[PDB]
């Protein structure tokens, strides 16, 4: 593909606790951050060929021109990647957050804080 | 990856001109040289300028 970025929020990131994916985050930060700076390095593209010249002193200039036309024409596919199941490996330990403790916590918060007033009396 | 292909052809044509230079040069320099002195009077044109150095170096 190329670079992407979402909600990189490092403190809560590691914090997860779905344990076989909990551990991953702690490393995945550093794998990532190393990653982020390493991209931040490269050039994207290199020069554009001085074809006018390379004909000059590649006087096998059929080769130059062959490769020239090919280079002028030459347009890479883009990379491979595969972990766009992580999008959904998210949604699972995206409902864990939700269900487990979204709802638990509202429920629990209700009785307790409510539970403040009446026993405050 | 493109550059290597091109630069090879460039490098060959340069190297071939240098070799042709040495070999051209070795034949040229070995061929021609003789008339400077086969005309002894083209060593007189050395003697002439040398008399115009004689007088006319000072």
Q: For chain A, say whether B4 makes contact (Cβ under 8 Å).
A: no
Cβ partners under 8 Å of residue A6, min gap 6: none
The answer to whether B2 contacts A59, with C-beta atoms less than 8 Å apart, is no
* Residue found under tokens 């300028």: B49
Phi then psi for residue B40, to 5 deg, are -60, -20
B30 lies within 8 A of chain A by CB? no
The owner of tokens 């982020």 is A36
Tokens of A42: 């490269």
Find the DSSP H helices in B1-58: 2-31, 35-38, 41-57
**Contact criterion met (CB below 8 Å) for A57 and B10:** yes
Would you call A7 helix, strand, or coil by DSSP?
coil
Provide, as residue numbers in chain B, all residues whose Cβ is less than 8 Å from the Cβ of A55: none
Cα torsion angle, A66, A67, A73, A78, sign:
positive
How far apart, in whole angstroms, are the C-alpha atoms of residue A96 and residue A19?
A: 12
For B9, the closest of A49, A60, A71 (CB atoms) is A60
Q: Is A17 left (phi over 0), alpha (psi -120 to 50) or beta?
A: left
By C-alpha distance, which of B9, B8, B4 is closest to A59? B9
Closest listed residue to residue B7, CA positions, set A49, A70, A45? A49
DSSP A26: H
Directed axis angle between helix A61-73 and helix B2-31, to 10°? 160
Contacting A residues, span 35-74, partner chain B, CB-CB under 8 Å: 49, 54, 57-60, 63-64, 67, 71
Distance from the Cα of residue B47 to its chain's centroid: 23
Q: How far apart are CA A72 and CA A65, in angstroms?
A: 10
B18/A91 Cα distance (integer angstroms): 69
**A14: which DSSP letter?**
T
Tell me how far CA of residue A34 lies from CA of A21, A116, B7, B41, in angstroms.
20, 48, 36, 82
H or E element that contains A84: none
Q: What secondary structure letter does DSSP report for B39?
A: S
């Amino acid at each position: 593909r190329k670079l992407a970025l979402k909600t990189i929020d490092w403190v809560a990131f590691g914090e997860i606790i779905p344990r076989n994916q909990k551990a991953v985050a702690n490393s995945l930060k550093s794998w990532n951050e190393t990653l982020t700076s390493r991209l931040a390095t490269l050039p994207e593209k290199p020069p554009a060929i001085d074809w006018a010249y390379y004909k000059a002193n590649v006087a096998k200039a059929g080769l130059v021109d062959d490769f020239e036309k090919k280079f002028n024409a030459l347009k890479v596919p883009i990379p491979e990647d595969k972990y766009t199941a992580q999008v959904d490996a998210e949604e699972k330990e995206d409902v864990k957050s939700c269900a487990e403790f979204l709802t638990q916590s509202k429920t629990r918060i209700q009785e307790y804080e409510k539970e403040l007033e009446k026993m405050r009396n | 990856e493109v550059k290597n292909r091109l630069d090879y052809h460039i490098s060959v044509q340069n190297m071939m001109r240098q070799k042709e230079q040495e070999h051209m040069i070795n034949w040229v320099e070995k061929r021609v040289v003789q008339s400077i002195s086969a005309q002894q009077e083209k060593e007189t044109i050395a003697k002439c300028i040398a008399d115009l150095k004689l007088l006319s170096k000072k």
